């Protein structure tokens, strides 16, 4: 007797002129509206889609409350870095997975998008820190860091900028090319399970 | 904001030995990718020299191979260009700039295309007898 509306916002998330920064990533709420996954798989050829907890084929006919997705851009050979279990630059600095991660890890090429000749200088990352990074944290100060024993103040040699500008230009190789990155963090809580699946 | 500082030149004589050295200030030499480069007067500039990250990768050309030896440390952050056997045709003003990433030579892209970012002032390094 009712019949499906609020096809929720992917298509707003997925096909878009522009990302945001690894150190900044952007973040939506998908809720009070059914999912169907089904447009994610005409969209592209798809580079990676690995993920844990759930099975790919079975999304449809289970239910969760509140869905999250987030996107940037990170480069080609440190994809792998967004996993849980993994250090690395990214994976310790900028963006961490919890241990106990469910929901869905999606990738895909962007040489023809996000990058043009001379250079692409306007996707940055974080090289520095003090410390670690607790999961799901998004870090967007930019502040002078101390290296060694002498504090710098104002700005000069042994203090750096923390954030650097990822060079793109069409002629890098598959590593070194820009891949965006979309990750789905499936979750159910104190509240009732309401996003749910289409069904006959 | 960053600034890079170039060291060195003088009436050096063929034969000679000399260190370039130029001076990263707000950027750091580990993470960034730099080379020199130098333009004779009356030609177009052409590069020199490179590394690449942190692991080092040096790329010479056909016209400048066998002379210098391209070296970094990461206690003081200044590259250096030593000079060894130089010839008489090595005449010229000096730049060094750096690009972040492994920039040079990594896919079907080498320093050639000079699009670099932050680009040095420069030294003048002479020599004659």
């Known amino acids: 007797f009712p019949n499906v509306t609020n096809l929720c916002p992917f298509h707003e998330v997925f096909n878009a002129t522009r990302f945001a920064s690894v150190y900044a990533w952007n973040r939506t709420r998908i809720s009070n509206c059914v999912a169907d996954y089904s447009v994610l798989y005409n969209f592209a050829p798809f580079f990676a889609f690995k993920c844990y907890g759930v099975s790919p084929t079975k999304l449809n006919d289970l239910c969760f409350t509140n869905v999250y997705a987030d996107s940037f851009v990170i480069k080609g050979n440190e994809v792998s870095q967004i996993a849980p279990g993994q250090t690395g630059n990214i994976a310790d600095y900028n963006y961490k997975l919890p241990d106990d991660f469910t929901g869905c890890v999606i990738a895909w090429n962007s040489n023809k998008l996000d990058s043009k000749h001379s250079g692409n200088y306007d996707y940055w990352y974080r090289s520095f820190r003090k410390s670690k990074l607790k999961p799901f944290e998004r870090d967007i100060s930019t502040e002078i860091y101390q290296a060694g024993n002498k504090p710098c103040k104002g700005k000069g040699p042994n203090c750096y900028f923390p954030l650097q500008s990822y060079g793109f230009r069409p002629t890098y190789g598959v590593g070194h090319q820009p891949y965006r990155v979309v990750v789905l963090s499936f979750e159910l809580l104190h509240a009732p399970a309401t996003v749910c699946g289409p069904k006959k | 904001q960053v600034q890079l500082q170039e060291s060195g030149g003088g009436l050096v004589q063929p034969g000679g030995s000399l260190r370039l050295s130029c001076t990263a200030s707000?950027?750091?030499?580990?993470?960034?990718?730099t080379g020199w480069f130098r333009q004779a007067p009356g030609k177009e500039r052409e590069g020199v020299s490179c590394?690449?990250?942190?692991?080092?990768?040096?790329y010479y050309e056909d016209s400048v191979e066998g002379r210098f030896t391209i070296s970094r440390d990461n206690a003081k952050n200044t590259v250096y260009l030593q000079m060894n056997s130089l010839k008489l045709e090595d005449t010229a003003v000096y730049y060094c700039?750096?690009?972040?990433?492994?920039?040079?030579?990594?896919?079907?892209?080498?320093?050639?295309?000079?699009?670099?970012?932050?680009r040095g002032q420069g030294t003048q390094v002479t020599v004659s007898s």
């Open positions: 700039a750096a690009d972040p990433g492994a920039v040079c030579h990594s896919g079907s892209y080498y320093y050639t295309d000079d699009d670099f970012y932050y």
């Open positions: 707000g950027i750091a030499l580990h993470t960034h990718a």
């Open positions: 590394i690449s990250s942190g692991d080092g990768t040096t």
